[PDB]
Paper text:
At the cytoplasmic face of the NPC, Nxf1•Nxt1-bound mRNPs encounter the cytoplasmic filament nucleoporins Gle1, Nup42, and Nup214, which specifically activate the DEAD-box helicase DDX19 to remove Nxf1•Nxt1 from the mRNP8. DDX19 is a member of the DEAD-box helicase family, which are RNA-dependent ATPases composed of two RecA domains (referred to as DDX19NTD and DDX19CTD throughout the text). Gle1CTD plays an important organizational role by providing spatially separated binding sites for Nup42GBM and the DEAD-box helicase DDX19/scDbp5. A comprehensive structure-function analysis of DDX19 indicates that binding of Gle1CTD•Nup42GBM induces a conformational change in DDX19, thereby stimulating its ATPase activity.
To understand the structural basis for IP6-independent DDX19 activation, we determined crystal structures of human Gle1CTD•Nup42GBM in complex with DDX19 in the presence of ADP or AMP-PNP•Mg2+ at 3.6 and 3.4 Å resolution, respectively. The heterotrimeric Gle1CTD•Nup42GBM•DDX19∆N53 complex exhibited similar conformations in the presence of ADP or AMP-PNP•Mg2+, with the auto-inhibitory helix still bound between DDX19NTD and DDX19CTD. The Gle1CTD−DDX19CTD interface involves 40 Gle1 and 35 DDX19 residues to generate an interaction interface area of almost 1300 Å2. In the first interface (interface 1), Gle1CTD residues of helix α4 (H495, E491, and Q487) form an extensive hydrogen bond network with each other and DDX19CTD main chain atoms (residues 380–382), as well as a salt bridge between Gle1CTD residue E491 and DDX19CTD residue K385. In the second interface (interface 2), the acidic C-terminal helix of DDX19CTD is recognized by lysines on the Gle1CTD surface, with salt bridges forming between DDX19CTD residues D470, D472, and E475 and Gle1CTD residues K416, K419, and K479. To gain further insight into how Gle1CTD•Nup42GBM binding facilitates DDX19 activation, we compared the structures of Gle1CTD•Nup42GBM•DDX19∆N53 to those of apo DDX19∆N53. The most apparent difference was a rotation of both DDX19NTD and the auto-inhibitory helix away from DDX19CTD, despite the auto-inhibitory helix still being bound between the two domains. Therefore, we considered our structure as an early intermediate state that forms immediately after Gle1CTD binding to DDX19, but before release of the auto-inhibitory helix and separation of DDX19NTD and DDX19CTD. In summary, Gle1CTD binding to DDX19CTD causes a cascade of conformational changes that partially releases the auto-inhibitory helix and prepares the residues involved in nucleotide binding to form the closed, active conformation.
Residue numbers in the entry:
A (entry chain C): 379 to 423
B (entry chain B): 384 to 698
C (entry chain F): 54 to 479
């Protein structure tokens, strides 16, 4: 009796610093969009 | 390779399934053909019945498949049939059911962009109850349309051009080759369906567990397809009819991060196609901009024409 | 019989142009006057409010027939015209555009007059005026047809009139509702059906004869019949002529098959096994008798298969409604019996079924029907499918006969082995 949780977003941790700096930027950089989905903290950046 | 490794996992896992019921297909007895006949029949008719009229009756088809697949007897043409007839049958119906979902997306959804949603919900719902069926869908979906992975087939040495087009998903008889236009639609309808499955959920059933193939696979698809050089006509086409179908659901989920992606392709990835595409093939790339110029300034991506509404679910 | 109803239905269901690859023939009054050709609406230099309405209703550039018709009609001096092009090429939108160019809404009296064969068709033509001319404030429309109640001493103030042939004559001739000498443009829409009534032909000419000589005379017809062409010359003096030959349809891309069956219950069992054998989206079934069609559709519905039934008793608008749903994907199978027998421009039709063979009166093969039924499915390179149900040796005799005329093989399909049925639609 357990229900798993959602992977819709990726945790802020367990994420490389490259991807972290991409999500934080006002503009994305061509050819370097992160494959993992964004985190819940940087949604409204 | 993370994707290519995962890509192979599903493919060879399907090949295992091709072999597990090996002998059900390869049988020539009058009974052995009839059993293969009645199963392939009472397992694909309901999928072809999927209609836009009302979710009120779209539940019959869903129940008829769940019963069929769960082992229960199903009212087929004349006599009722089930899987208990043959033990290697279960693993067979799961194969034919999965292909028909992509096949219905190959022909109907290509022609009819709106039929994608009433078909997907059923697929997304069966995916929940029986995960093994979903891997089989992802198996066929990937093969017939490798652009859904997404990965572009590269050109290996030795210019067997006819041999290469086959890998690109073109359907070619020994003598015949498929036209681009009859091919482009075949692939649109395949990813319009895929773009629909990742955002839709079966309303009924009381399932506290989440979507099997979540909307995360939509982000990676856009990310992974925009980090590689675009094909001339294929990319600018598939990129469009993916956003029209799933762009609304991605804008709500990844509110800002998604917009960042869009402001990129518009000023950074659009130049990447203007040179690649010749003047005789700019048709797709033009729709792709007419799609953004509205959405970019309107701050809103329209709901996909044909989305199942509250009325549809009551009737 | 009743070509107005066929036209009316074709109007309600037509959503866009019918593609045509043929080139347009032009036969100008002065043979050496240069040819008038245009490729965009900007070139014609239309009034701003008009060009506005053109772009408003979804038109990007002139259609093939319009590329030559519009400049010829807008040219000075006013040059008459006789245009021949199949239904759906943009004939109506052409003369509506020409009308709205000559009207000057400041003058409150009829300046443009159109003759439509019936009340219903007049309405459809009227709707196009209202759309394209939505940016002409104070511009109104008057319907001069039977049923329109009017009293003496009243005077039409509308700048455009549309009506049936028999009543428009009364408007100008006796009741003095219109002064013909102010009419600047005159249209006779759909002459191919106008001639179907002997009364209409004479009433239309008498009207044409009350008009001035500087009045621009225009006539349009879907068919190139001789009875039409002989009738058009009497109506349009010193006419230019524009022709666009009807788009031919072929079986280059379709695969023809047939199935032998002992009876009708077998034709139904044969039909069931086909489902699930291949990827069939939607499909049309043509039947011989209404008694059988209602049975099939009922039998098909019994299986839980969702179906649409088209029968003759249904009203015209009712027929359109079912067809619309079919296009919208509400229904996946359309069973019909001589109602719209030629084949509908549904896009999602994976297969055409001939539960009973296209039979002409007298018991001959209806090749035009067979062609049109299937020609729609695979035009311009698309792929299509065909299946013919044979229930007797007489029906079989007809089948080879069709195979003769087209000289293309209708192979046999055995419905017992699914493995064989999968091969054809791959
Ligand atoms: N230039 C155009 N561009 C786009 N659609 C058009 C154009 N002209 C007509 N249509 C559309 O095509 C359909 C058939 O128009 P058309 O005038 O009306 O037929 P017909 O030649 O039988 O009178 C209508 O739905 C109309 O809106």
């Amino acid at each position: 009796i357990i229900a798993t949780d959602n992977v819709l977003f990726t945790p802020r941790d367990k994420l490389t610093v490259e991807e972290l700096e991409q999500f934080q930027s006002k503009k994305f950089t061509l050819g370097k969009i992160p494959l993992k989905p964004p985190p819940l903290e940087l949604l409204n950046v | 390779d993370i994707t290519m490794q995962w890509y192979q996992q599903l493919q060879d896992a399907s090949m295992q399934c091709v072999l597990t019921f090996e002998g059900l297909t390869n049988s020539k007895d009058s009974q052995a053909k009839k059993i293969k006949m009645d199963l392939q029949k009472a397992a694909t008719i309901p999928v072809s019945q999927i209609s836009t009229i009302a979710g009120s009756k779209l539940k019959e088809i869903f129940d008829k498949i769940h019963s069929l697949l769960s082992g229960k007897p199903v009212q087929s043409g004349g006599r009722s049939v089930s899987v208990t007839l043959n033990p290697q049958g279960l693993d067979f119906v799961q194969y034919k059911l999965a292909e028909k979902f992509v096949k219905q997306g190959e022909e109907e959804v290509a022609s009819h962009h709106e039929a994608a949603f009433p078909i997907a919900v059923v697929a997304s719902g069966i995916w929940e109850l029986h995960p093994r069926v979903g891997d089989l869908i992802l198996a066929h979906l990937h093969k017939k349309c490798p652009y859904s992975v997404p990965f572009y087939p590269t050109f290996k040495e030795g210019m067997a051009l006819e041999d290469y087009q086959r890998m690109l998903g073109y359907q070619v008889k020994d003598s015949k080759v498929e036209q681009q236009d009859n091919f482009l639609k075949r692939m649109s309808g395949m990813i319009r369906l895929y773009a629909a499955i990742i955002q839709l959920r079966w309303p009924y059933g009381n399932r506290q567990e989440i979507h099997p193939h979540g909307l995360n696979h939509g982000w990676r698809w856009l990310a992974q397809i925009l980090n590689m050089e675009p094909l001339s006509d294929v990319t600018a086409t598939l990129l469009f009819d993916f956003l029209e179908v799933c762009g609304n659901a991605l804008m709500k989920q990844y509110q800002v991060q998604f917009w960042k992606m869009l402001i990129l392709i518009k000023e950074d990835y659009f130049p990447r196609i203007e040179a690649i595409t010749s003047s005789g093939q700019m048709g797709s790339f033009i729709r792709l901009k007419q799609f953004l110029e509205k959405c970019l300034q309107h701050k809103d991506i329209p709901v996909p024409k044909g989305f199942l509404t509250s009325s549809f679910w009551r009737s | 019989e009743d070509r107005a109803a066929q036209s009316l239905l074709n109007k309600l269901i037509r959503s866009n142009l019918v593609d045509n690859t043929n080139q347009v023939e032009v036969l100008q009054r002065d043979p050496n006057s240069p040819l008038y050709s245009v490729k965009s609406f900007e070139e014609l230099r239309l009034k701003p409010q008009l060009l506005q309405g053109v772009y408003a209703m979804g038109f990007n550039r002139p259609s093939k027939i319009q590329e030559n018709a519009l400049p010829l009609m807008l040219a000075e001096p006013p040059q008459n015209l006789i245009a021949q092009s199949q239904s759906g090429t943009g004939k109506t939108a052409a003369f509506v555009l020409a009308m709205l160019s000559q009207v000057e809404p400041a003058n409150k009296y009829p300046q443009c007059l159109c003759l439509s064969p019936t009340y219903e068709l007049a309405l459809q033509t009227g709707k196009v005026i209202e759309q394209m001319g939505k940016f002409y404030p104070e511009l109104k429309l008057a319907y001069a047809v039977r049923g329109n109640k009017l009293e003496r001493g009243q005077k039409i103030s509308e700048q455009i009139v549309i009506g049936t042939p028999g009543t428009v004559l009364d408007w100008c001739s006796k009741l003095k509702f219109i002064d013909p000498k102010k009419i600047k443009v005159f249209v006779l829409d759909e002459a191919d059906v106008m001639i179907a009534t002997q009364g209409h032909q004479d009433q239309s000419i008498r009207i044409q004869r009350m008009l001035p000589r500087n009045c621009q005379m225009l006539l349009f017809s879907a068919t190139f019949e001789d009875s039409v062409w002989k009738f058009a010359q009497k109506v349009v003096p010193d006419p230019n002529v524009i022709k666009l030959k009807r788009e031919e349809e072929t079986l280059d891309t379709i695969k023809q098959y047939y199935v032998l069956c002992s009876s009708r219950d077998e034709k139904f069992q044969a039909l069931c096994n086909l489902y699930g054998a291949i990827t069939i989206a939607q499909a049309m079934i043509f039947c011989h008798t209404r008694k059988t069609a209602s049975w099939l559709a009922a039998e098909l519905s019994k299986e839980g298969h969702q179906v649409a039934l088209l029968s003759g008793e249904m009203m015209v608008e009712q027929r359109a409604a079912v067809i619309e749903r079919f296009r919208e994907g509400k229904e996946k199978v359309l069973v019909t019996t001589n109602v719209c027998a030629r084949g509908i421009d549904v896009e999602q039709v994976s297969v055409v079924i001939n539960f009973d063979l296209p039979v002409d009166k007298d018991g001959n093969p209806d090749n035009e029907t067979y062609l049109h039924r299937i020609g729609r499915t695979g035009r311009f390179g698309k792929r299509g499918l065909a299946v013919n149900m044979v229930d007797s040796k007489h029906s079989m005799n007809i089948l080879n006969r069709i195979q003769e005329h087209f000289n293309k093989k209708i192979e046999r399909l055995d419905t017992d082995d699914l493995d064989e049925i999968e091969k054809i639609a791959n």
